[PDB]
Write a protein that binds this ligand. Sequence first.
Ligand SMILES: Nc1ncnc2c1ncn2[C@@H]1O[C@H](COS(=O)(=O)NC(=O)[C@@H](N)CS)[C@@H](O)[C@H]1O
Ligand SMILES: Nc1ncnc2c1ncn2[C@@H]1O[C@H](COS(=O)(=O)NC(=O)[C@@H](N)CS)[C@@H](O)[C@H]1O
Ligand SMILES: [Mg+2]
Ligand SMILES: [Mg+2]
Ligand SMILES: [Zn+2]
Ligand SMILES: [Zn+2]
Lengths: 463, 463
Amino acid sequence: EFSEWFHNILEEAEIIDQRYPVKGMHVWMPHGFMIRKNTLKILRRILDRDHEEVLFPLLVPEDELAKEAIHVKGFEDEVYWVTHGGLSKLQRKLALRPTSETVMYPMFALWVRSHTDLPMRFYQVVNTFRYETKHTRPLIRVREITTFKEAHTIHATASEAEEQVERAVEIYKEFFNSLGIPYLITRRPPWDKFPGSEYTVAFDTLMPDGKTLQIGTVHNLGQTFARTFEIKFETPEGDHEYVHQTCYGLSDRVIASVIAIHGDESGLCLPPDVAAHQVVIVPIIFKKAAEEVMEACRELRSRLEAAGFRVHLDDRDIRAGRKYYEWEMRGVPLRVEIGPRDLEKGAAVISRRDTGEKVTADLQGIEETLRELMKDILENLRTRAWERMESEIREAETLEEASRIVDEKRGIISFMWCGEEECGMDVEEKVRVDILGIQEEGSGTCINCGREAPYRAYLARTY
Amino acid sequence: EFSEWFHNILEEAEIIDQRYPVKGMHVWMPHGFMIRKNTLKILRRILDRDHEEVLFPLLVPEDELAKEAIHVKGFEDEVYWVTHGGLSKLQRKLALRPTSETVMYPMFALWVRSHTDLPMRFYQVVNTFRYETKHTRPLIRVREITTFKEAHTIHATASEAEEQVERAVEIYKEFFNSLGIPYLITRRPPWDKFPGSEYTVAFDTLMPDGKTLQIGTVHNLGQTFARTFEIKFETPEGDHEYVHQTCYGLSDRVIASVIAIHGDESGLCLPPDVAAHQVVIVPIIFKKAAEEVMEACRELRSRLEAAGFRVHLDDRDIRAGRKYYEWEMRGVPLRVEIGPRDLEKGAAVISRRDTGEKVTADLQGIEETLRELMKDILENLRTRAWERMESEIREAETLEEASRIVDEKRGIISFMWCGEEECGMDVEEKVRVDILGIQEEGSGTCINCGREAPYRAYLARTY
Ligand SMILES: Nc1ncnc2c1ncn2[C@@H]1O[C@H](COS(=O)(=O)NC(=O)[C@@H](N)CS)[C@@H](O)[C@H]1O
Ligand SMILES: Nc1ncnc2c1ncn2[C@@H]1O[C@H](COS(=O)(=O)NC(=O)[C@@H](N)CS)[C@@H](O)[C@H]1O
Ligand SMILES: [Mg+2]
Ligand SMILES: [Mg+2]
Ligand SMILES: [Zn+2]
Ligand SMILES: [Zn+2]
């Protein structure tokens, strides 16, 4: 049911067009692009406080790519290779970046010299490529991740790296809270961690179909990469030690989830700061004081633009009904309607998208009325969102009880686990599910092997 | 001399790092990225008035790519090819986009149906790839054009297309005028036009080394592409005619030229709206009322931020001299200095980057003082720039006189030309130069063959 809804809204709302001749590569249409744009504005406000945006190349030579032990093994046959430059075959294969460690790190080796240089915090929003699963899904599992934001940091001590991991987590929390997206934070199992990292922390959110979606990862790379690419720095004493690195990223999934989670029957419902328009003015006219209604709307639009609003005056010549439907299925938060009546009273009708509540406000101080409504809409959407997710995280004491809950109610399943490979693998195989990760807490007994369970773990059917 | 200057400033000002293992692919460092960012902000303000930003894929399948007669011939061996997806060879070669006609047009065939749909105006800023000349030059001739802005339009009548070409030209004029970049507009010879177009209009600017740089092109594609990809539309009568298309683009060259043209001995000099910082506050202190000087600067910074300025308070602990040098070689327009004296008077020293003129202003209304200075700096830079270019465009009546001027003074050479292939080719071969394009005007006699010359043409040594 959700799948169909999603695919249809992506088309109706004109977000992406999937009819491109190459599987897993979609087109961002005007409207979709605007949402993506606003989502990135929000992200960058946060990231630009302490990160420096850069932009590295797309192509990586075998030499550099296969320079890592496990990392290269991790993306072995998941990499696209350019072999020819025109008719002639390149004397050195070039891979489209799957992620940029092998692109930036050799360069980091040069930029880093003294401890005065550290810490360094960079990020870029580029397009990456991954040749994976025959199962292609819009914004969720694409071959061309068109909105891959990857941040990479460099530190003097391992201590600072761990500290950075904590900061990244807080940055994502804030990012997501701004999109009203709920999340579960866990430490992925050591066999699912980013190829070559010390450990991976992941953010997972729940899709309306009971399936889970990884919407963010933070990795503590320790110094394994530093040693590989020779990223050393001079200490205040005169010694030469390797650096401690971390990296974290998000993809188009963040947009998929903002669409999916605040999804609706009427179409899209979006956080005010993400919608293409925050306020759409719709004039109601039947050839009766029209000239005065129109000039009341125009006055209003200009007044809102100057106030900092992303407003749109829909003066098209169609029935107000159709207009309502359109801007509603497109996710516009507030609709301001103006008719002869209310006009001859100095007021207008303001309709919310999340609730449907129409109120009456004085065009005189409407700016503040709108700002407040917007703050309200996000809080509501974020709240609802959190309730819906938590109400889907259920505890299980028996491995059999887990199977019953997953298969019947879907959602996330909480449980105490010993934290052993074989036991975890067995759990996954038996329940045909995936262990998202752990969260350290009081002990107990592993739901599967009964041994001492140091971790609170979660599992679910994932994307 | 210029070459060395350019390369050194790109490094000193930390714009791009060329030390990447793959020739023709450079890295945008933090500072460079900020300039690129601001340059694009300026561009988008203009383009977003009547264009809709989109984002298409990077990869194009042979099927689509080689679907055009001349277009495919034009980028035959200039295209990079991905042949393998992991270890397995793709059953369909994929080319990195050189430009996106073959990527978007098949998709345009679907989006276009009724005349009510037209006109459509799109654009995107993506990275494109071109395997060309062994001669790689930073921001001027790269394999990965990291800042390729391509706009594509669709029209019902050929008349509107030509009209669009005129609009594009005006858009670029405004873009460039904002960067204070001077330009010569001409109609490229029919053998240099964009592969498959009806005709190409190009913008050329002059580099400090007397060489010319193409910084923008507009193409009228007529309906040749429409027929190729089947982009038809229903007329108000019920007929099905093809569409009229145009497309135009810019690359990183725009940034190269803003750096080069307003170049300087002290380093970078940039239009206020392009610099990473428009105002850098430098407090002068020698342990004498410091606490009061610092709090005067902080107060000022905040005050400027809230006014809309991109300001930076350099409170580092180094000699004010070094600070001056740094922000000067980096292109910061205005430097605001505050010391005990001026402070105890309610004034500060404002230094211009283009001139070096230091003035004294009341911290009380400094906001306006700064805004005015910024407007002034651009006008000055744009003016100077235009003078320098025009003073390098020289007329020639004899083909021999041309050779003397080019070889001795470089620059651009104006001349009357018959407009024939063979004559033009001959001119180029004999003068070892390139014919930029023509400009229709009163007749005369071709500088080479003496026949009737309908066109005013220009030539020069180019990049
Ligand atoms: N095929 C895909 N389609 C869409 N999003 C994806 C895809 N693969 C991964 N992602 C998203 O991108 C994020 C980062 O991917 S990753 O492999 O975990 N980590 C990185 O690549 C690290 N180098 C951090 S920059 C994931 O958390 C996930 O939300
Ligand atoms: N290798 C290159 N490096 C940097 N800039 C380039 C390169 N090749 C072309 N350009 C710049 O990019 C602009 C557009 O390139 S073009 O081939 O003339 N035209 C297009 O590709 C058309 N499809 C318009 S979008 C040129 O005007 C030129 O200024
Ligand atoms: Mg697993
Ligand atoms: Mg030529
Ligand atoms: Zn166990
Ligand atoms: Zn001639």
